Nucleic acid binder design. Structure first.
Ligand SMILES: [Mg+2]
Length: 1202
RNA sequence: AAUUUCUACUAAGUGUAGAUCGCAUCCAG
DNA sequence: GATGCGTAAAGGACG
DNA sequence: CGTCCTTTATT
């Protein structure tokens, strides 16, 4: 009984192994003499070029078929599509009509005589040359005759366009699912808004755009949709909506622009047409320091157009008073928060302005509408913002001083960068080496980008009642120029952030278009590549084109050393392969197939479905079985032991056996003398398949992929991992010069970087060079493999994880959370919520032999954040921080893998599509999404390297506890052993009571504060405890529906940390407040006394003191010692939860800090979810809904504690 | 600071620890 | 964010 | 013929 070990051999997946390929002997000389590499580097260039020419015919071919087409179901489909109350029967009716529509488009493509020719040899040899009209391009297409086979991959990418399936690549899909659905939506919008388009306005568009061939109304009739399948037709339809610019250039207004004016001018909100997506085939980074510089000078010197639009916007905003503040608008969004701070000094007073009119009891159903309606608003006028502005304060004037300040900052930064615009300037050093120059460009780009990004707010996305077009004329003219800095900024950064070395490479064919296509022995002459082994070393051997058979003649040498030559036989896709060989002209003549058999095949009765007859399919199997016996190329290669025919449920049952039997890998001896002579003579090319684990000096644990590779040829491996075909060989030219490599000279001691390492310095007897692998040309060999090619343990993973979780008595849960003080923090929890392990993942502990050395990745990040501060916020420091986090999570994955194996444990993770990230966490959402993906990816085939490969958990019996990754949005609910959970109320919660603070202690008014105090059931001093007790029922406050216990007694117990910062003792601070105002707090119930007080400074200190008492999380930024969590509520035994009572202990039963509390409580929501499983029937476990609500959570957190 | 490749390394001396699905194509803001 | 290949053996063109 | 390139068959 182990949950983990029921998840092996569940599904097949493909992986690629990568290696360095080191030439052996005369191989590199022979390759150099034959000029093979130069051929392939050129071929790659021409191959990329021919693909674009090939596109042109494909594109032209699409227009011919799409123009001719006429869709049959159109009117019937659109109607059914529009019904808003469809029976489930009618929804399937729509799907059939939708499938038929796509099938009409696909069959129109594939029904041509021409369609088959496009992806055959013929397109390059004959069709394309006649199509082209340029002598040079025809020569290029001509260079690839006899090399058509190498285009297959491209051909497949184009075959996807003509599919009838509902797939992103398809033409039919773009027409029917996306463009039709949009067209229908535009028909709906058109009839509502039809009238507002002026009689004159339409007749324009018909002459100016339509050219008088069609009426604008036609484009919104359903039967007219055929015109818009082509890119030409789409351009016209989108032109009507967007507006057109003639050959003369006269601006022609679009229907969507008309609607804008109308809704604007009348302060209404009618809808606007969606434009149609492009057709599927209709129509790069800076490469050098000289190019990067050239753009910086050209676009940002003092007489560039961007600098011209800055001077115009300075003149425009200098005249800000001259314009109408009622017709100047600020877009609603982040820019409202910023501009609110800019002039008042306060983010949320402009919030209060609109709140002042809109603002007293708050049901959250009213609160959402209260909150939702303000979000609905598109923008605010300067007049509305001045309606906010208290008297004596001018919103326009101090906006002017802020904008003008930003342009003066640009001009000062220009003077500091001025020598970077001299025509005389030349670059002394490379930019990445040249921190000074990169800092100069960054400073100028930033000051302009910030000015651009700030000024962008003055839009109002209008859609806006009468706008000051005198202001928005000059403004729009200049801003459209200024917006060019966005593209410039991104490109220059992406260049500075790049690595110094280049991974550019080109594929090697050795003059074979199907080079190294597969490893099968029979095909080894055709492919001219194979695999040799000598002891521990492996080699890729390549026969030269003039001597393809040279390896086949070699025989074993008894006396001398021998290579091990691979003997690889595969029967790939028997369902594909078995018929073609047995129904081929060559074999059909040999073997008389009864008319029943060719019937069954032509009829399709063997295939599962309504046409299926078990006997018919059985008969076909026996046909295949006898023919395999008659076909000795297969029967002799594979020891076929088929199950008795009667047992087969379907044809796939027979095929599955064939597929699993049809694989065999062994080795044959081959004279090492004879083979080596072949290499010397130039007839054979030999590379060692190499990574650092194959080094003579290598010792200790190898790479996981080193194990997969060696296991391919291990006889303890039995199809668990298959060696796949389609391997590719590349050449990556060096991108660094050996002289320009950083060297640590031999016999001089090198300073070690890790603080925790005891050894501070290392001295070697040899030189070591940074990035040495890129100072030389390097072959790399990519090898695909197939794991669990024939899976036996077929079940839906999630349903199985749910069944085991239900019946498992003590389920273990691994809760992972992101902390402010901790990169990641782990809590392991048993089936009843008891903490089993809790610790931070700030330090990764690496194990080699018995030695342990830790790496504090949190200290690493801190040192790199400090390095970011120094040298401003340099472009690279951000990258270095990004990659360090990306390499950190690759360490964390292994730690999670151990815990999962150790505790047979289910993982609990945050749902990142619902929760909101505080940004106090170090690991931002973008890095965590990466992590949760890697997690999923590892758990498709979870393996412990140090385990023996044949054991479950080992490299041949990997755990499959997770389904293949789909999308970040799919990282929700559950993926096998991984559960995704909202982070809500997981940190600011008392773990010993489930208590949470649902009160709003923000001070608004004296009257608001009185109603707050009166809503408590009692407020009294407790002499026998020296505490103030606040009995409350949450029913008497608003937005308290989620809480379950409702009745709580708060206490002013212990200290809090007010935020600089000060420590506040709650009990004495209440006494201090009450004594300041003469309140007798010892006189039983005090509630009357506090409300009697008439001073506003009293209620503000009181609400502030309530805020602190209900502030359960207390921290000092920069003081990692102080992150304590303290509860104002007693538990069953009258104890207050204080996290510091447990951070002292080594094994604590409750969370040790706020960060541990989060991981603890993320894990507990899975426990609730397991509780939901144990409630349901085994059959309906699929139906159980995992997502926990804030109401369900608070009930579980407050009842399960006991 | 060496790497199939990435990060952290130097890990006891040409390397350590973990991770690593390649290749082509299309569509998106 | 999705597509598709990870192939041996039939089949044919060219000397 | 051979040899090299092409085309093919799909639960
Ligand atoms: Mg190692």
């Amino acid at each position: 009984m182990s949950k983990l070990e029921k998840f092996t051999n569940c599904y097949s997946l493909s992986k690629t192994l990568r290696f360095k390929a080191i030439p052996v002997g005369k191989t590199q000389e022979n390759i150099d003499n034959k000029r093979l590499l130069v051929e392939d580097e050129k071929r790659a260039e021409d191959y990329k070029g021919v693909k674009k020419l090939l596109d042109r015919y494909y594109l032209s071919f699409i227009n011919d078929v799409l123009h001719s087409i006429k869709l049959k179901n159109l009117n019937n489909y659109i109607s059914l599509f529009r019904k808003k109350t469809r029976t489930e029967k009618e929804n399937k009716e729509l799907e059939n009509l939708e499938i038929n529509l796509r099938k009409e488009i696909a069959k129109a493509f594939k029904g041509n005589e021409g369609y088959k020719s496009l992806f055959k040899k013929d397109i390059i040899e004959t069709i394309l040359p006649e199509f082209l009209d340029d002598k040079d391009e025809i020569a290029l297409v001509n260079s690839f005759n006899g090399f058509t086979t190498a285009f297959t991959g491209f051909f497949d990418n184009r075959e996807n366009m003509f599919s009838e399936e509902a797939k992103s690549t398809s033409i039919a899909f773009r027409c029917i699912n996306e463009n039709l659905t949009r067209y229908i939506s535009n028909m709906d919008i058109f009839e509502k808004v039809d009238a507002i388009f002026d009689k004159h306005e339409v007749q324009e568009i018909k002459e100016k755009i339509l050219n008088s061939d069609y009426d604008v109304e036609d484009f919104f009739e359903g039967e007219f949709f055929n015109f818009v399948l082509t890119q030409e037709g789409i351009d016209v339809y989108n032109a009507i909506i967007g507006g057109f610019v003639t050959e003369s250039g006269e601006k022609i207004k679009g229907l969507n622009e008309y609607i804008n004016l109308y809704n604007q001018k009348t302060k209404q909100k009618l809808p606007k047409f969606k434009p149609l997506y492009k057709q599927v085939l209709s129509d790069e980074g800076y490469t050098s320091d000289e190019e990067v510089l050239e753009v910086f000078r050209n676009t940002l010197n003092k007489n560039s157009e961007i600098f011209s639009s800055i001077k115009k916007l300075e003149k425009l905003f200098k005249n800000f008073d001259e314009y109408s503040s009622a017709g100047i608008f600020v877009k609603n969004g982040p820019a409202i928060s910023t501009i609110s701070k800019d002039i008042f000094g306060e983010w949320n007073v402009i919030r209060d302005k609109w709140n002042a009119e809109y603002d007293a009891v708050v049901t959250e159903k009213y609160e959402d509408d209260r909150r939702k309606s303000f979000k609905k608003i598109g923008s605010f006028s300067l007049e509305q913002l001045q309606e906010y502005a208290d008297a004596d304060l001018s919103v326009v004037e101090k906006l002017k001083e802020i904008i003008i300040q930003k342009v003066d900052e640009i001009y000062k930064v220009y003077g500091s960068s001025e020598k970077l615009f001299d025509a005389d300037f030349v670059l002394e050093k490379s930019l990445k080496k040249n921190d000074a120059v990169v800092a100069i460009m960054k400073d100028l780009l930033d000051s302009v980008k910030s000015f651009e990004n700030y000024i962008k707010a003055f839009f109002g996305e209008g859609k806006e009642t009468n706008r000051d077009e005198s202001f928005y004329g000059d403004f729009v003219l200049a801003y459209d120029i200024l917006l060019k800095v966005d593209h410039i900024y991104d490109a220059i950064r992406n260049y500075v952030t790049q690595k110094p070395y280049s991974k550019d490479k080109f594929k090697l064919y050795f003059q074979n278009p199907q080079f190294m296509g597969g490893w099968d022995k029979d095909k080894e002459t055709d492919y001219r590549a194979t695999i040799l082994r000598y002891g521990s070393k492996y080699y890729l051997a390549i026969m030269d084109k003039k001597y393809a058979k040279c390896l086949q003649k070699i025989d074993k040498d008894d006396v001398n050393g021998n290579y091990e030559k691979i003997n690889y036989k595969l029967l790939p896709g028997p369902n594909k392969m078995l018929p073609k060989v047995f129904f081929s002209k060559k074999w059909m003549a040999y073997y008389n197939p009864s008319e029943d058999i060719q019937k069954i095949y032509k009829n399709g009765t063997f295939k599962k479905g309504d046409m299926f007859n078990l006997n018919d399919c059985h008969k076909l199997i026996d046909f295949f079985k006898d023919s395999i016996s008659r076909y000795p190329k297969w029967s002799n290669a594979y020891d076929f032991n088929f199950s008795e025919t009667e047992k087969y449920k379907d044809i796939a049952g027979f095929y599955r056996e064939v597929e699993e039997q049809g694989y065999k890998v062994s080795f044959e001896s081959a004279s090492k003398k004879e083979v080596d002579k072949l290499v010397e003579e130039g007839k054979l090319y030999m590379f060692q398949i190499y990574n650092k684990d194959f080094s003579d000096k290598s010792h200790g644990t190898p790479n996981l992929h080193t194990m997969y590779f060696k296991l391919l040829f291990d006889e303890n491996n039995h199809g668990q991992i298959r060696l796949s075909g389609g391997a590719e060989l590349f050449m990556r030219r060096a991108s660094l010069k050996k002289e320009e490599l950083v060297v640590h000279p031999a016999n001089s001691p090198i300073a070690n970087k890790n603080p925790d390492n005891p050894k501070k310095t290392t001295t070697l007897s040899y030189d070591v060079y940074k990035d040495k692998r890129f100072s030389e040309d390097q072959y790399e060999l990519h090898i695909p493999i197939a794991i669990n090619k024939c899976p036996k343990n077929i079940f839906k993973i999630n349903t199985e994880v749910r069944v085991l979780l239900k019946h498992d008595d003590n389920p273990y849960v691994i809760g992972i959370d992101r902390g402010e003080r901790n990169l990641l923090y782990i809590v392991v929890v048993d089936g009843k919520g008891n903490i089993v392990e809790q610790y931070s993942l700030n330090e990764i502990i690496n194990n080699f032999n018995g030695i342990r050395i830790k790496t504090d990745y949190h200290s690493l990040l801190d040192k790199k954040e400090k390095e970011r501060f120094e040298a401003r916020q340099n472009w690279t420091s951000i990258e270095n921080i990004k990659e360090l986090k990306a390499g950190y999570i690759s360490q964390v994955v292994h730690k999670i893998c151990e815990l999962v194996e150790k505790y047979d444990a289910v993982i609990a993770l945050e749902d990142l599509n619902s929760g909101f990230k505080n940004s106090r966490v170090k690991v931002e959402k973008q890095v965590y999404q990466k992590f949760e993906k890697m997690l999923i990816d590892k758990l498709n085939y979870m393996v412990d390297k140090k385990s023996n490969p044949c054991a479950t958990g080992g490299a041949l019996k990997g755990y499959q506890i997770t389904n293949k990754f789909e999308s970040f949005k799919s990282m929700s609910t559950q993926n096998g052993f991984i559960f995704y959970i909202p982070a809500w109320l997981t940190s600011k919660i008392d773990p010993s009571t489930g208590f949470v603070n649902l009160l709003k202690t923000k001070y608004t008014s004296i009257a608001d504060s009185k109603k707050f105090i009166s809503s408590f059931d009692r407020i009294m001093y407790v002499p026998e405890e020296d505490l103030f007790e606040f009995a409350l029922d949450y029913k008497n406050f608003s937005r308290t529906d989620a809480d379950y216990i409702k009745k709580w007694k708060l206490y002013s117990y212990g200290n809090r940390i007010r935020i600089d910062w000060e420590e506040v003792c709650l009990t004495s601070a209440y006494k201090e407040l009450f004594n300041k105002y003469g309140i007798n707090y010892q006189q039983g119930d005090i509630r009357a006394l506090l409300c009697e007080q008439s001073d506003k400074a009293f209620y503000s200190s009181f609400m502030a003191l309530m805020s602190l008492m209900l502030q359960m999380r207390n921290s000092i930024t920069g003081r990692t010692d102080v992150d304590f969590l303290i509860s104002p509520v007693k538990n069953s035994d009258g104890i207050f939860y204080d996290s510091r009572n447990y951070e002292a202990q080594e094994n604590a039963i409750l969370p040790k800090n706020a960060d541990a509390n989060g991981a603890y409580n993320i894990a507990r929501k899975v426990l609730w979810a397991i509780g939901q499983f144990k409630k349901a029937e085994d059959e309906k476990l699929d139906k159980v809904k995992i997502a926990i609500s804030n109401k369900e959570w608070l009930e579980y957190a407050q009842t399960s504690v006991k």
